[PDB]
Amino acid sequence: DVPENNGILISIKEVINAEFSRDGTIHSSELKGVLELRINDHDLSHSNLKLADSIDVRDKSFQFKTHPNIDKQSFLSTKLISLRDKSKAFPANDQSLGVLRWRKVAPAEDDSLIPLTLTTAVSPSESQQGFDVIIEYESVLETELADVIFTIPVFPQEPVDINTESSTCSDAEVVNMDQEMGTSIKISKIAANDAGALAFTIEAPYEDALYPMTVSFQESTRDKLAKSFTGMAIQSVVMANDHDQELPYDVITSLKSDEYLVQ
């Protein structure tokens, strides 16, 4: 996509990195966010977003950073994205305007930025020259994840044997095998707030060959009352001149994994 804009479109994009030990202990995690504004209507040029009253805009752990054209002090005191110069206007050319960034970082053992926890266990197998692997995952997301991709860095000769009534998603299937990348297994759904195991057998020389495992998920929502993973949200859009005059808009809240791995 390059999603459709009916005037003013607000996008809240978050990206999550996360490294775990094999057993499941969080080693690190980093979350980067941005809020962007696309406007394609010169009548909406003189708008002002206002963020949800539930966000602490002074919380230093988010490292909030307003773009320079934006007025940092009304943001900090009022939770209001507005122009530095009251007489000017946002470009109405449908370009993505970055108006606010954030970056949050958790130390070891801190699971506050983790939308999907992971554990792995390996034991040598009977049925293949390799290992029986179990990947246990728990989601803490309000929505579901669709087509989550675990990927194991080996390109076995014998096909991967997905233990099928031991796994939560029974259409769990290998979808890619590559000499470089390894083997990728898709999982159709991980539903909101639920636990799960992907269990399978794979040929490998030794445990170390199976790491790092990597996972890839991604999620979206065009709902107007949707909070991002960290809580970011838009309470309303409003005229620069008259703060009582509401303005029409859609908002897209997304979350992607980037480097999300067990090591």
Partner: peptide, 9 residues
């Protein structure tokens, strides 16, 4: 760059 855009008017 989403982070370079100019105020208009």
């Amino acid at each position: 760059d989403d982070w370079n855009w100019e105020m208009e008017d």
